[PDB]
Structure formats: structure tokens, C-alpha cells
Amino acid sequence: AKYTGKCTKSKNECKYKNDAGKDTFIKCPKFDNKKCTKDNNKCTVDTYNNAVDCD
């Protein structure tokens, strides 16, 4: 239940692949606690805990 995705500092949006095999892109949090500082960054998303973490 661990999916790895990359986000950009310009688009502030991450992108990861699910069990479907397709590439899914989701916006990242604009909170100082978690956000995109550099391009091609890395984030985390869990469907079990519904938790997300942006570089």
C-alpha cells in the first residue's frame, strides 16, 4: 500500500502510479509542513492510512 510519486515546485503537484498501472497526478499541500521546493521531487501516498507526504 506504498506508492512513490514525484512532484514539482512550479506545479506543486505530485504524480504516482496506482495498482491500475496508470499515472495519477494529485496536488500537494501548500503548508510549510509539506510542500514542493524543487522539481522532480518525491512524495508519499497511502490508501490504507489516507496519509500524504510531500518533499
C-alpha cell at position 37: 521546493
**Got the DSSP string for 1-55?**
--EEEEE-TTT-EEEEE-TTSSEEEEEPP-STTS---STT--EEE-TTT--EEE-
| C-alpha span between 45 and 54 (Å, rounded) | 9
Structural domain spans, the chain: 1-55
Residue position matching grid coordinates 510542500:
35
Long-range contacts of 32-40 (CB under 8 A, 24+ apart): 36/7, 36/8, 36/9, 36/11, 36/12, 37/9, 38/9, 39/8, 39/9, 39/10, 40/6, 40/8
For residue 29, what are the CA distances in angstroms to 19, 32, 34, 43, 55? 23, 8, 6, 11, 10
CB 52 within 8 A of CB 24: no
First to last CA, the chain: 19
CATH superfamily of domain region 1-55:
Antifungal protein domain (2.40.50.60)
Largest Cα span, the chain? 31
